C-alpha cells in the first residue's frame, strides 16, 4: 500500500468512525429517554411505599442500624434522633447526569427545628454538594464530646466521592425492606 | 400482628411491581441496543475493509492501549503483526453473549486462520475458545504469561476484563489508539 493510500484510508476510517460516534450518541439519548420515562412511572409506587413506611415505627433507623456500611456511622444519640425520621426520598434530576437529592423528613423532635433535611449532589463533571442548614435546639450532636451521623450533611469535600450518598441512592432506597426485616426463629 | 405484618406484605407487593417496571425498562433498553447494533454493522464492515489496508493496525492499537499494552510480550507483538481483522458480534438476544474473532494471515506461530473466544450465559457465565494449533517450537510456554493464554483462560468467564475492554472500548473506536499525535 502507498504512503498516500494509507493516509487516505486513515481519512476514510475517521469519517466512518464519526458516524459510529453519531450512532452511539443517538443510542445513549434514546436510552436516557427510557430511564426518564420509567422514573416517572415508578414515582407513584415510591409514593405509595413511603405512605406505608410511615405507619411503621422506627423503620428507617432500623434499616440504617442493620446496614453493613451505614451502621458504623451511627452513634447512640444519633439513633435517638433518627427515631423521628418518618420518610426518606431520593430524586434524580430529570437529565439524571445533573445529579440527585436526598430528603430526610423528621417529626418534631428535641434536636432540631427542621422539618426536612436535604443533601443534593451536582456534576463537565465538577462534583459538588450542598445541604440544608441544621437549626439545632441547643443540642448539636456534632459539638458534644464517634463523629456524629449528621455531620454528613455539612461535609462537602468529597462531593463526587460521597459514599453514603451512593449507598442510599443505589442500595438502600431501591430496597430498604431487606435491612428492616430481621429473621427470627 | 394485623397492622405491621400486613404493611410489610404491602411493602413487598409494591416492590414486586417496581421490579416488574425495572424489568420492563431493561427490555426496552435492550431493544434500543439491538436497533443500533444493526445500524452500526454496515459501518463496522466498511471500517474492516479500510483497516485491512493499514499494516500493523491492530498491533499498534493494542500497544497504545492503557490496559492491553501490559498484556503483550515482545514475541506476542511479532505474532500480532499478522492480525488483519478483529470482529465482535453480540448475539441477537444480547443476553446470550458475544464472540470475538481474530483473523490472522499465514504466520510462523500457528496454523489457525481465525482465533475465537465466545462468552455464554444453566444461566452460569461460560466461555469457549478455538484450540490454537501452534507450530513446532513456537508457543505460549516461556515476561509474564503470553497474550495468547487469554484464549485458554476460562475460569473468570463472567469477569473477563480483556473481553469486555475489546467489546466496550476498543471495538467501538480503535482509531484513537492507532493514531499517535506528532508535533
Ligand atoms: Ca435483615
Ligand atoms: Ca492516541
Curated annotation (Swiss-Prot), chain A:
Organism: Homo sapiens (Human)
Keywords on record: Acetylation, Chaperone, Chromosomal rearrangement, Cytoplasm, Disease variant, DNA-binding, Endoplasmic reticulum, Host-virus interaction, Intellectual disability, Isopeptide bond, Methylation, Nucleus, Phosphoprotein, Proto-oncogene, Ubl conjugation
Chaperone keyword on record: yes
Name by which UniProt lists this protein: Protein SET
Modified residues (N6-acetyllysine): 33, 115, 135
Quaternary data: Headphone-shaped homodimer. Isoforms 1 and 2 interact directly with each other and with ANP32A within the tripartite INHAT (inhibitor of acetyltransferases) complex. Isoform 1 and isoform 2 interact also with histones. Isoform 2 is a component of the SET complex, composed of at least ANP32A, APEX1, HMGB2, NME1, SET and TREX1, but not NME2 or TREX2. Within this complex, directly interacts with ANP32A, NME1, HMGB2 and TREX1; the interaction with ANP32A is enhanced after cleavage. Interacts with APBB1, CHTOP, SETBP1, SGO1. (Microbial infection) Interacts with herpes simplex virus 1 VP22.
Cell compartments where the protein resides: Cytoplasm, Cytosol; Endoplasmic reticulum; Nucleus, Nucleoplasm
Taxonomic superkingdom: Eukaryota
Entry comment describing in which tissues the protein is expressed: Widely expressed. Low levels in quiescent cells during serum starvation, contact inhibition or differentiation. Highly expressed in Wilms' tumor.
Lineage: Eukaryota, Metazoa, Chordata, Craniata, Vertebrata
Stretches with biased composition (Basic and acidic residues): 4-10, 132-144
Chief location category: cytoplasm
Biological process terms in GO annotation: DNA replication; negative regulation of DNA-templated transcription; negative regulation of neuron apoptotic process; nucleosome assembly; nucleosome disassembly
GO molecular function: chromatin binding; DNA binding; histone binding; protein phosphatase inhibitor activity; protein phosphatase regulator activity
UniProt entry tagged with the keyword Ubl conjugation: yes
Region of interest (Dimerization), residue spans: 4-43
Region feature (Earmuff domain): 44-172
Region of the whole protein represented: 39 to 238 of 290
Modification(s) after translation: Some glutamate residues are glycylated by TTLL8. This modification occurs exclusively on glutamate residues and results in a glycine chain on the gamma-carboxyl group.
A GO term from the CC aspect: lipid droplet
Amino acid at each position: 500500500t502507498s504512503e498516500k493510500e494509507q493516509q487516505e484510508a486513515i481519512e476514510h476510517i475517521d469519517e466512518v468512525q464519526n458516524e459510529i460516534d453519531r450512532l452511539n450518541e443517538q443510542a445513549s439519548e434514546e436510552i436516557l429517554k427510557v430511564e426518564q420515562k420509567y422514573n416517572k412511572l415508578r414515582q407513584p409506587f415510591f409514593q405509595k411505599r413511603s405512605e406505608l413506611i410511615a405507619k411503621i415505627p422506627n423503620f428507617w433507623v432500623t434499616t440504617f442500624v442493620n446496614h453493613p456500611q451505614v451502621s458504623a456511622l451511627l452513634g447512640e444519640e444519633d439513633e435517638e434522633a433518627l427515631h423521628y425520621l418518618t420518610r426518606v426520598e431520593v430524586t434524580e434530576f430529570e437529565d439524571i447526569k445533573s445529579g440527585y437529592r436526598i430528603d430526610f423528613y423528621f417529626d418534631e423532635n428535641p434536636y432540631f427545628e427542621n422539618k426536612v433535611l436535604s443533601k443534593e449532589f451536582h456534576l463537565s463533571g465538577d462534583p459538588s454538594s450542598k445541604s440544608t442548614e441544621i437549626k439545632w435546639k441547643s443540642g448539636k450532636d456534632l459539638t458534644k464530646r464517634p463523629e456524629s451521623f449528621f455531620t454528613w450533611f455539612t461535609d462537602h469535600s468529597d462531593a463526587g466521592a460521597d459514599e453514603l450518598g451512593e449507598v442510599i441512592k443505589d442500595d438502600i432506597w431501591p430496597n430498604p425492606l431487606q435491612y428492616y426485616l430481621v429473621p427470627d426463629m
